Short mmCIF file of N, CA and C in Angstrom, two decimals:
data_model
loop_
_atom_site.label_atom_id
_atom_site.label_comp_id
_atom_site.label_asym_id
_atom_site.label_seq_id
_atom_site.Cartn_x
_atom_site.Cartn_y
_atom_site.Cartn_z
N UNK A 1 23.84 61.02 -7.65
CA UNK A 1 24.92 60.05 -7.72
C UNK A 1 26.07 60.44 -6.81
N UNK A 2 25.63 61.14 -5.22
CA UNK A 2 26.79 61.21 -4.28
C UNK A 2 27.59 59.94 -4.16
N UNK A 3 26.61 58.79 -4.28
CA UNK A 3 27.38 57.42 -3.41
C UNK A 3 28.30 56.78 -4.51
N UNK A 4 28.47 57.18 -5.94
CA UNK A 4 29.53 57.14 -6.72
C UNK A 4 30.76 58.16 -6.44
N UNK A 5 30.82 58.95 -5.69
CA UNK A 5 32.10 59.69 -5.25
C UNK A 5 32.29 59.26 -4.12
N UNK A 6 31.74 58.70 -3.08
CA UNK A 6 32.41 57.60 -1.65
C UNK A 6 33.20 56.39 -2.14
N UNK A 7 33.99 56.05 -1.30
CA UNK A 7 34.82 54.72 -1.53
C UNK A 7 34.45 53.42 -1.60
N UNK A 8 34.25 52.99 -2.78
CA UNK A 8 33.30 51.91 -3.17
C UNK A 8 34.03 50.69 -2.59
N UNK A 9 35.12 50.21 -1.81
CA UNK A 9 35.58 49.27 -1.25
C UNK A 9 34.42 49.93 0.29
N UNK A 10 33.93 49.02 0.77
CA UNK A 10 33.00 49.09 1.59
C UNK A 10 33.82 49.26 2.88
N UNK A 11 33.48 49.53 4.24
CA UNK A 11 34.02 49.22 5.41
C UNK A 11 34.02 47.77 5.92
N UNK A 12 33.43 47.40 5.80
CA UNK A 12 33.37 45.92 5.60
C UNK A 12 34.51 45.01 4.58
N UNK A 13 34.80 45.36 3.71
CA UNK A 13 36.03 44.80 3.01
C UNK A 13 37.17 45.36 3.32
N UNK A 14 37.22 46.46 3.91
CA UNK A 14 38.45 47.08 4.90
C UNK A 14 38.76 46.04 5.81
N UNK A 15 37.84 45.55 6.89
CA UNK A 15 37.55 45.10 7.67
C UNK A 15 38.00 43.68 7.49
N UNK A 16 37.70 42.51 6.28
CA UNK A 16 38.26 41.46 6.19
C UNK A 16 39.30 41.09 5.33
N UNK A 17 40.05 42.06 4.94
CA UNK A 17 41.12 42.34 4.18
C UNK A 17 42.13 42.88 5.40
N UNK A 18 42.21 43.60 6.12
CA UNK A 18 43.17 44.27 6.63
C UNK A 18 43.11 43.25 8.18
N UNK A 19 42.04 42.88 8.66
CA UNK A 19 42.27 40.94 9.64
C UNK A 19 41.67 40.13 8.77
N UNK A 20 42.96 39.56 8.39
CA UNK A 20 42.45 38.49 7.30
C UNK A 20 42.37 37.21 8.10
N UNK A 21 43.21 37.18 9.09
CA UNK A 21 43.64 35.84 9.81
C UNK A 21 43.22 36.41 11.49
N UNK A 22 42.64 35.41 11.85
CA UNK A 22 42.88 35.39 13.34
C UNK A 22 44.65 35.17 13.75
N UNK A 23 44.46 36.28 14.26
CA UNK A 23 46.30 36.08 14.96
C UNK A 23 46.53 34.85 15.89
N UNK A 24 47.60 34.69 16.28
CA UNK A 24 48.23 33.51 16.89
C UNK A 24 48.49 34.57 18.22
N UNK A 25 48.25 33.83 19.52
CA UNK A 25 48.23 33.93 20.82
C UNK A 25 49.57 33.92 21.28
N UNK A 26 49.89 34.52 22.06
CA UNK A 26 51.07 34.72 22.82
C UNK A 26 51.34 33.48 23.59
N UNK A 27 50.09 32.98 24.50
CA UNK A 27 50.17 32.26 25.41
C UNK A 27 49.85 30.71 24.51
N UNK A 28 49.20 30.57 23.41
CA UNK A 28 49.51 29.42 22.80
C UNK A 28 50.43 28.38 22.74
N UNK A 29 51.51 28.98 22.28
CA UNK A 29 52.77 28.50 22.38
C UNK A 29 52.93 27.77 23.39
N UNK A 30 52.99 28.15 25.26
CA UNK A 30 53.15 27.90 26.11
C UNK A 30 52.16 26.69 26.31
N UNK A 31 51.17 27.13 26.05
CA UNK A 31 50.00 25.67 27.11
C UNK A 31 50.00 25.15 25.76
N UNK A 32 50.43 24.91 24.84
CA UNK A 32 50.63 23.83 23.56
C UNK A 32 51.73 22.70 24.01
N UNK A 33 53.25 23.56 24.42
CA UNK A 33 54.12 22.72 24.49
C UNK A 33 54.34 22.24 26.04
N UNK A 34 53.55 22.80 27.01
CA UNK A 34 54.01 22.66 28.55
C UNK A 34 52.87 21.05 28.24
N UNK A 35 52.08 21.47 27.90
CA UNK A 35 50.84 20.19 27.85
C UNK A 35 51.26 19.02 26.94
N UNK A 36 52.45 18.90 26.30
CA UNK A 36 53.01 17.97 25.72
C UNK A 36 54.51 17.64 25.85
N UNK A 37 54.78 18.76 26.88
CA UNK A 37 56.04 18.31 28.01
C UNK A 37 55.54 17.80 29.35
N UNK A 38 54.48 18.16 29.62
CA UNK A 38 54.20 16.90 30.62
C UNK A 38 53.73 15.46 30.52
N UNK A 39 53.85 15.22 28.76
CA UNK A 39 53.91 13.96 28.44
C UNK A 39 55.11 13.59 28.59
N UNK A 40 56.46 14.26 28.35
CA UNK A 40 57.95 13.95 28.25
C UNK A 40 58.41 13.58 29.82
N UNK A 41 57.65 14.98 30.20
CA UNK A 41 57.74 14.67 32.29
C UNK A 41 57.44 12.98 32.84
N UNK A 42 56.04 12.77 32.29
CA UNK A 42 55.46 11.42 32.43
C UNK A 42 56.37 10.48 32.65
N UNK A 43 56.30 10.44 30.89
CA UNK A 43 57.28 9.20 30.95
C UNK A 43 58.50 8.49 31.10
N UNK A 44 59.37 9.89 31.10
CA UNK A 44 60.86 9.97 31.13
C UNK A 44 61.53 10.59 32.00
N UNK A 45 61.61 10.71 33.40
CA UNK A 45 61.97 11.60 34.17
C UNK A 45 62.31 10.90 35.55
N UNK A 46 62.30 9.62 35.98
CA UNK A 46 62.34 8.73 36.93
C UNK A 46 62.20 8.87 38.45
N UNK A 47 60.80 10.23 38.18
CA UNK A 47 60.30 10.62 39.80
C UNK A 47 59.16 10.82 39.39
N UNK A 48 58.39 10.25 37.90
CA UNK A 48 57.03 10.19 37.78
C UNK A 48 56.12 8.91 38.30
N UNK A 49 55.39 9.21 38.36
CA UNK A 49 54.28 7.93 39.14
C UNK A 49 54.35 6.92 37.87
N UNK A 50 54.35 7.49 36.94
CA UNK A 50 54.11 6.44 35.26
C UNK A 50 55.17 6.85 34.30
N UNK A 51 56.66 6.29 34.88
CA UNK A 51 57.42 6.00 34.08
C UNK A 51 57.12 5.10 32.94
N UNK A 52 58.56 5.39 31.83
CA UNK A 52 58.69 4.11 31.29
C UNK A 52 59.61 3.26 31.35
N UNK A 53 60.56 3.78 32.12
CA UNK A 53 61.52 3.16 32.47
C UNK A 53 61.65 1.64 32.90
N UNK A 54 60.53 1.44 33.83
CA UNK A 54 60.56 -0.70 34.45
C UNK A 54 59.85 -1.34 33.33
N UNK A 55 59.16 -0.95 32.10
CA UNK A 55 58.33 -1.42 31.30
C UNK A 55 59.43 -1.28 29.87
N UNK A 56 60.18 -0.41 29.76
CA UNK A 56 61.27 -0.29 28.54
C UNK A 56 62.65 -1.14 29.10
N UNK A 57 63.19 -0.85 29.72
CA UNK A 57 64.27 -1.96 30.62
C UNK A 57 63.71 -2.62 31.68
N UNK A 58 63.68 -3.67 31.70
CA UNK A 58 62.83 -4.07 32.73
C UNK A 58 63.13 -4.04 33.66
N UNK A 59 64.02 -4.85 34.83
CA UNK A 59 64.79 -4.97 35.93
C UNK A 59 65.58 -6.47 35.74
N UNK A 60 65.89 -6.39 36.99
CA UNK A 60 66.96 -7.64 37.30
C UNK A 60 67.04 -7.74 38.82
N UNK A 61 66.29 -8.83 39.19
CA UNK A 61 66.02 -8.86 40.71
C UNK A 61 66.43 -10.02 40.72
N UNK B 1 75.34 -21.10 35.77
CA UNK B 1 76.35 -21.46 36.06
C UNK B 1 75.99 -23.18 36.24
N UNK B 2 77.44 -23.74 36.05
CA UNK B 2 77.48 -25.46 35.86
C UNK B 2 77.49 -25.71 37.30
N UNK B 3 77.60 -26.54 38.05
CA UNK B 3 77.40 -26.89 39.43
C UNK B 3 78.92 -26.82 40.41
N UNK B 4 79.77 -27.04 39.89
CA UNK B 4 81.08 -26.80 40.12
C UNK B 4 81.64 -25.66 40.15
N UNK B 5 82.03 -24.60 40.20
CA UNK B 5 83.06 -23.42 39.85
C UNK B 5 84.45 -23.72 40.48
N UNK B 6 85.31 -23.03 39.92
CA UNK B 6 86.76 -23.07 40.57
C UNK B 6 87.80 -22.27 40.29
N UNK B 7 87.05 -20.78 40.99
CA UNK B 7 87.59 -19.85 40.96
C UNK B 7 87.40 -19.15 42.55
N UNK B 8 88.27 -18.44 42.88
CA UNK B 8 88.34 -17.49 43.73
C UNK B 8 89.62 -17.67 44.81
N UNK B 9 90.09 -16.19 45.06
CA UNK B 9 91.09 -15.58 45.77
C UNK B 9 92.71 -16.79 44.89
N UNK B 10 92.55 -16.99 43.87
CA UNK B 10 93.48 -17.51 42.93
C UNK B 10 93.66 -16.62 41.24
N UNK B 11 94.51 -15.50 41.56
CA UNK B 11 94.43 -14.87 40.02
C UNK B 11 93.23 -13.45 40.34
N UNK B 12 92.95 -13.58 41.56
CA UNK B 12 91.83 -12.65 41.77
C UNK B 12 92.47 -11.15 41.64
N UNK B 13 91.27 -10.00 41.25
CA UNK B 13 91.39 -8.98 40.85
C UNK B 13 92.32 -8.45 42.97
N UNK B 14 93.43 -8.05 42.83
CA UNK B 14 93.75 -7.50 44.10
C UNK B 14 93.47 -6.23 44.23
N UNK B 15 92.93 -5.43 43.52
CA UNK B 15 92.72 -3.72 43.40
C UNK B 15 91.71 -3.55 42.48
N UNK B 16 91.10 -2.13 42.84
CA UNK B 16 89.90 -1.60 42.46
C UNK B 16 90.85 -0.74 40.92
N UNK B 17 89.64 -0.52 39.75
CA UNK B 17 90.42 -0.19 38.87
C UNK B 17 89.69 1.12 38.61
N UNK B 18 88.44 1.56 39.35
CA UNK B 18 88.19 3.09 39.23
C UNK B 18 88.42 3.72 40.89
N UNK B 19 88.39 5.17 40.96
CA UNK B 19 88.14 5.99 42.44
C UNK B 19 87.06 6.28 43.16
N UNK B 20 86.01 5.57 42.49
CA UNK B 20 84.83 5.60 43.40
C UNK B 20 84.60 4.40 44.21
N UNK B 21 85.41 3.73 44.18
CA UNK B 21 85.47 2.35 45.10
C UNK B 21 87.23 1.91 45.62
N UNK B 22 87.67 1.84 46.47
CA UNK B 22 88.49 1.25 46.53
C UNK B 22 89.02 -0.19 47.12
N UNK B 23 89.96 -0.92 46.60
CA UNK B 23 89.85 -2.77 47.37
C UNK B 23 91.09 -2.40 47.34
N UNK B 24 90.96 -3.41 48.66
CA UNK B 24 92.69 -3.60 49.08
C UNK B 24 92.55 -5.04 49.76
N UNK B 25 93.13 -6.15 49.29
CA UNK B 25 93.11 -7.26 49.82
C UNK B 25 94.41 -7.89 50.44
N UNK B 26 94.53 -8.54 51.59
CA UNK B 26 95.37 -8.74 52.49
C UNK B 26 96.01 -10.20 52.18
N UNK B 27 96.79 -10.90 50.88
CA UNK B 27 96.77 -11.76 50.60
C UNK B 27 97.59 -13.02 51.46
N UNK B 28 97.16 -13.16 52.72
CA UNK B 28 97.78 -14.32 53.43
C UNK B 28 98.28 -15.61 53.30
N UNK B 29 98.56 -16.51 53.77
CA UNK B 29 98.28 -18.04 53.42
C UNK B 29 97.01 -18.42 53.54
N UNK B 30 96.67 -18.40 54.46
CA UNK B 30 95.43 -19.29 54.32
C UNK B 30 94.21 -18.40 53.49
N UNK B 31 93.94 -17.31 54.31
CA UNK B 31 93.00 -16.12 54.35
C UNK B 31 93.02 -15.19 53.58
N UNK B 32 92.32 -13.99 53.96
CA UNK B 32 92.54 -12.72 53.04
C UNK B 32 91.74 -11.66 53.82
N UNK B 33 92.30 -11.05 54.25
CA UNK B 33 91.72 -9.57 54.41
C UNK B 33 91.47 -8.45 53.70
N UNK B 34 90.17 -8.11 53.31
CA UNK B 34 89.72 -7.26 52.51
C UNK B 34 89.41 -5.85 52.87
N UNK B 35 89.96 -5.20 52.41
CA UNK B 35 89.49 -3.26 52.65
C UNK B 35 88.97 -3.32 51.68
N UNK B 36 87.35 -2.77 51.61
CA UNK B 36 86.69 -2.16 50.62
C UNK B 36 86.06 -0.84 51.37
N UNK B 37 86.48 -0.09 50.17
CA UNK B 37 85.89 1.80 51.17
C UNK B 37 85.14 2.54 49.78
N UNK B 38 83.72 2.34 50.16
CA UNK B 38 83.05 3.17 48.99
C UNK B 38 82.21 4.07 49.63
N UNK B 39 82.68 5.47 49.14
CA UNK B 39 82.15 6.33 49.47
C UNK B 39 82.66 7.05 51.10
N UNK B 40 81.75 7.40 51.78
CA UNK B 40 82.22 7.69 52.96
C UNK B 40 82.27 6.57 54.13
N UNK B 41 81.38 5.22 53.43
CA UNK B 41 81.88 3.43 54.14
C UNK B 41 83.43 3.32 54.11
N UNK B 42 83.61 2.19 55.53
CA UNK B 42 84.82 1.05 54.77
C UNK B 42 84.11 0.16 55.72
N UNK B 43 84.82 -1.01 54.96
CA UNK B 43 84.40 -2.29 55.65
C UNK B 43 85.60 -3.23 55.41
N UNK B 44 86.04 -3.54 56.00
CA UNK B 44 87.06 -4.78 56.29
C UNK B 44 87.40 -5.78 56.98
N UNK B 45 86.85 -6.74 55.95
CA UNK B 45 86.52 -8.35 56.66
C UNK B 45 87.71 -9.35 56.24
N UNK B 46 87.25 -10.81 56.68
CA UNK B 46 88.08 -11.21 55.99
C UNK B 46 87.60 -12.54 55.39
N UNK B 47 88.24 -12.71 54.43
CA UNK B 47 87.53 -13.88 53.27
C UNK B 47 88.66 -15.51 53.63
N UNK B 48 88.25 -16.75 53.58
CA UNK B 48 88.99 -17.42 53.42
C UNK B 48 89.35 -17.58 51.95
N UNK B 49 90.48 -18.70 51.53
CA UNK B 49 90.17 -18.85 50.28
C UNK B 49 88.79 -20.43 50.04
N UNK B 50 88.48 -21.15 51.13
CA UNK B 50 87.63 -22.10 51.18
C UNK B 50 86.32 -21.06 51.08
N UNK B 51 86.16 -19.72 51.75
CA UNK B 51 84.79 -19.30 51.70
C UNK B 51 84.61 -18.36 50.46
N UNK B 52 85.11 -18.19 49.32
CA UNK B 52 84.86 -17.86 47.90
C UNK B 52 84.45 -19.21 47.56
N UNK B 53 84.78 -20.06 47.66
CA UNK B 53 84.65 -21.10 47.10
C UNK B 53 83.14 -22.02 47.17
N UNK B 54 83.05 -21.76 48.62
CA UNK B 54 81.37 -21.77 48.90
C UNK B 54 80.37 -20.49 48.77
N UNK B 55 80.59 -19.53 47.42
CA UNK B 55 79.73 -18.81 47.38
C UNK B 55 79.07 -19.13 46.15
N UNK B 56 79.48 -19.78 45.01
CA UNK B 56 78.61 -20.09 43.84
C UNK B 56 78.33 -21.73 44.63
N UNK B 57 77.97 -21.64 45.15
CA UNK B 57 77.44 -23.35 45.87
C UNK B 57 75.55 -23.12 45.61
N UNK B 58 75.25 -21.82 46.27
CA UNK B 58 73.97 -21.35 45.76
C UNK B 58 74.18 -20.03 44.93
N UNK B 59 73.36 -20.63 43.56
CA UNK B 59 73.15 -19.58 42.23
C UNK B 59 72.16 -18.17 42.68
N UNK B 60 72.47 -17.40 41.95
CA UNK B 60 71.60 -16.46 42.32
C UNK B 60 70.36 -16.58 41.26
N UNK B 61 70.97 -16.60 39.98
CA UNK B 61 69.97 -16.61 38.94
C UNK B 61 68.68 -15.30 38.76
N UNK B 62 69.97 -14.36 38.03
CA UNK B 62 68.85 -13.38 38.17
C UNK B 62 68.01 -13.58 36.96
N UNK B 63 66.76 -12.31 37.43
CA UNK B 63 65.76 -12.81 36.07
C UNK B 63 64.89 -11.33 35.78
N UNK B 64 64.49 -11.41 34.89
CA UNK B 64 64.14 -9.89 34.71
C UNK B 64 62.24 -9.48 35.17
N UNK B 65 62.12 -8.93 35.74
CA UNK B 65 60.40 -8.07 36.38
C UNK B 65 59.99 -7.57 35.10
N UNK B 66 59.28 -7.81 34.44
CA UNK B 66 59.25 -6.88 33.08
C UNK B 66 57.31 -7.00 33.34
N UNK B 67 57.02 -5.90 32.42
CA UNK B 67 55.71 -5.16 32.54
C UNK B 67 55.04 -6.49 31.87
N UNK B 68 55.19 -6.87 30.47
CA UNK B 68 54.23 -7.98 29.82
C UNK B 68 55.50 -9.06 30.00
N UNK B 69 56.44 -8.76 29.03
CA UNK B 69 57.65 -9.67 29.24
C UNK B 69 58.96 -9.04 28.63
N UNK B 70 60.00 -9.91 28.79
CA UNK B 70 61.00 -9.64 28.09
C UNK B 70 61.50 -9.15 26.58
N UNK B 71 60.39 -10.00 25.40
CA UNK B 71 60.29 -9.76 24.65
C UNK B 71 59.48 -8.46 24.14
N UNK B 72 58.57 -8.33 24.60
CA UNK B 72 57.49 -7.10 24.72
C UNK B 72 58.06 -5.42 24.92
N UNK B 73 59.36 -5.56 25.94
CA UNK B 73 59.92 -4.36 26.93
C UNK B 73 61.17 -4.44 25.87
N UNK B 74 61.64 -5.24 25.08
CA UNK B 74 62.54 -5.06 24.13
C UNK B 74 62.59 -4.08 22.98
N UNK B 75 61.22 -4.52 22.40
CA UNK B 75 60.27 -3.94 21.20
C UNK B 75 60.10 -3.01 21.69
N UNK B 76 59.47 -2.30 22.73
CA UNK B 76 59.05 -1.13 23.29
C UNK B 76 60.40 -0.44 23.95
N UNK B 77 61.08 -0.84 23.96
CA UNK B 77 62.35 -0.22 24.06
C UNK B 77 62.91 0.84 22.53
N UNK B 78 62.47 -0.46 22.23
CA UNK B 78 63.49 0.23 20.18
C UNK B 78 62.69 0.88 19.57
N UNK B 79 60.93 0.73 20.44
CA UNK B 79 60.29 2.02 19.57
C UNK B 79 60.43 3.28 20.32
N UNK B 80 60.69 3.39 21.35
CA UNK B 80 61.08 4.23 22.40
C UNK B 80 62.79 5.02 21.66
N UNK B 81 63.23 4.29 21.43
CA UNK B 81 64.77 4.66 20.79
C UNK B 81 64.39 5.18 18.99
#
């Protein structure tokens, strides 16, 4: 009965206890919000190809 | 506009009321000489008071370019806001 005096929490439950979570990326952050500021770029910025500007105010010609 | 107007160089604005434009009008008898200087322009012509008078003779009638329409670019305005 040696393997009753080893540490009966396995290496393996070390293992998904101590990374419980996949960590969060450094660079996430960045290509999350740059890729949904170039929706803001798009539409609101009045040197994009696809404003919204002539379609939200229209003109007056 | 109604087909008539009967206004101009009578009661008219003689001066510019901000500094990014300035008017200076030359109020004669008959005529009027105008200084207008915007920006690093001037231009100074001169107006009768008969030729204000023939400028609403043709309307301009502006009208709006809109993507679907007027009503459409309104709505999409205030969901935009």
């Amino acid at each position: 009965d040696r393997v009753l005096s080893l540490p009966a929490v396995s290496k393996n439950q070390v293992l998904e206890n101590v990374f419980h979570t996949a960590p969060k990326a450094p660079v996430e952050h960045l290509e999350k919000m740059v890729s949904a500021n170039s929706k803001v770029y798009d539409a609101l910025n009045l040197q994009s190809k696809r404003v919204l500007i002539w379609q939200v105010k229209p003109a007056l010609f | 506009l109604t087909t008539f107007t009967f206004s101009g160089l009578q009661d008219a604005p003689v001066a510019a009321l901000s500094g990014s434009i300035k008017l200076n009008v030359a109020a004669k008898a008959g005529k009027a000489e105008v200084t207008v200087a915007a920006g690093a322009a001037k231009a100074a012509t001169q107006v009768s008071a008969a030729a204000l008078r023939k400028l609403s003779g043709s309307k301009i009638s502006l009208a709006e370019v809109a993507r679907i329409s007027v009503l459409h670019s309104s709505i999409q305005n205030y969901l935009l806001s």
